[PDB]
Each structure stands twice: as C-alpha cells, then as structure tokens.
Amino acid sequence: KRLKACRKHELYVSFQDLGWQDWIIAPKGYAANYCDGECSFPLNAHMNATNHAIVQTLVHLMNPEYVPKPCCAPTKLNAISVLYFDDNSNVILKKYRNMVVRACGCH
Amino acid sequence: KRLKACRKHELYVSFQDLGWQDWIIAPKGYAANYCDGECSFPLNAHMNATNHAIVQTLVHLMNPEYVPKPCCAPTKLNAISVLYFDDNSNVILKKYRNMVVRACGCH
C-alpha cells in the first residue's frame, strides 16, 4: 500500500522542452505532475476509492483475464494561466483548467 | 482508431460471486461495466479528455520510459438500488452510489 501504491508523482514541464518557448511569454514552465502506481488491496482511505473501483479490484482478482485492474487517475487538479503571442502577434492571457494534478486515486 | 480507443465495455456482476447469496432479495446481479482502451492522440479536452492528459501524452512521447500514458477512467457513474433482508426479517431497500460505469475518458 504505501510504497508501490497509486499516488501523485512530481513532474515539472517546461515549454522549452515542448518546443513552445518562442511564443510563450509567461510562465516558462510549471509543476504538472502525474499519477502512477498499483491499484490493488489494500486501498488506502486517503484516495477515496468509489464503490465501483472496489468491485472492479475484487472481480479482477477472481477473473484476472477478463477484467483489468482499475487505473490510477487524478482526483483533484488546479487550473493555470498562460500569457502568449498568437500567430497575429496579439498578446493573450488564457486560463487553462485541469493542468496541475494535486491528488491521485484508483478509478 | 474507432473502437480500440478508451471506451466503456460491458460487464455483468452476480451478487453470488460477491457473497450476497442469502441476504439479497433482488436483483441477483447488475451491469457494473468498466473502462479500457489506449489513450493517445487524437484527444479532445472539451469532450472526454482533460488538458492535463494532452500535456502528459506529449511528455510521454518524448521520454516514454519516464512518464506513462494517461489512463482510461470513468467520467460518469450511476447508482443502483437493491432489496434485502436483515436479521429481524425486515425488508430494506438500499441505494448504492457510483456502482455503474456509464462513460469513460482519458485522465
């Protein structure tokens, strides 16, 4: 449960690595993060798994070949703002939601 | 591809396989379903995918050994009602939330 389990992993992404540095004014990057890890019993209470996930995790144990294990996905994300030049050189500030993952869980 | 992408799949679960053999009156099972399928371009943040999943997909394509692809998970879940018996022969109707997967997306 603790060690190998489903949880938020740190990931900072820079627009320079994506190849968008020439037109993005601010910021030059951000903490995006991502989810990863095993989704099997025991299911830590902090991730608040749903009734469906508990049933899937159990059914997966009985029929390993006909039902996959649930997947580690975001339970909470934060929006972010970006200031950039469009193709017509206009300066735009846009708010992008669901960009930063704060918490993960088995769904 | 049309049907190899992230989507909902049919899956029926019998209460007997869970152990509700003598306390359940009806139903005897239900269609829990499940999400499965690969997450990759093409993606739409305004429909089933999120902005975060798009960014994660791009980072994965550049360092596939460091960051995994986003995963296919539920975007919509429905409840189910059951009629059952207690120790005093009382007939009880109970609603269980988030038991049925209706739609899936890349998260």
UniProtKB/Swiss-Prot annotation, chains A, B:
Q: Which cellular compartments is it found in?
A: Secreted
* PTM notes: Glycosylated at Asn-48. Glycosylation is crucial for recognition by the activin receptor type I/ACVR1.
Top-rank taxon of the source lineage equals: Eukaryota
The impact of changing residue 70 to L is: In a colorectal cancer sample; somatic mutation
Positions annotated as glycosylated: 48
Q: List the disulfide bonds.
A: 6-72, 35-104, 39-106
Q: How does it assemble?
A: Interacts with SOSTDC1. Interacts (when glycosylated) with type I receptor ACVR1; the interaction may induce HAMP expression. Interacts with type II receptor ACVR2B. Interacts with Hemojuvelin/HJV. Interacts with ERFE; the interaction inhibits BMP-induced transcription of HAMP. Interacts with BMPR1A/ALK3. Forms heterodimers with BMP2 in vitro; the heterodimer then binds to its receptor BMPR1A /ALK3 and may induce HAMP expression.
Protein task: Growth factor of the TGF-beta superfamily that plays essential roles in many developmental processes including cartilage and bone formation. Also plays an important role in the regulation of HAMP/hepcidin expression and iron metabolism by acting as a ligand for hemojuvelin/HJV. Also acts to promote expression of HAMP, potentially via the interaction with its receptor BMPR1A/ALK3. Initiates the canonical BMP signaling cascade by associating with type I receptor ACVR1 and type II receptor ACVR2B.
Q: Which family does it belong to?
A: Belongs to the TGF-beta family.
Disease (UniProt): Iron overload: A disorder of iron homeostasis with incomplete and age-dependent penetrance. It is characterized by adult onset of increased hepatic and systemic iron levels, increased serum ferritin, normal or high transferrin saturation, and inappropriately low or normal levels of hepcidin. The severity of the phenotype depends on age, sex, as well as additional genetic or acquired factors including alcohol consumption and increased body weight.
**Protein name, per record:** Bone morphogenetic protein 6
Q: Which organism is it from?
A: Homo sapiens
Q: Which gene encodes it?
A: BMP6
Which residues of the whole protein are included? 411 to 513 of 513
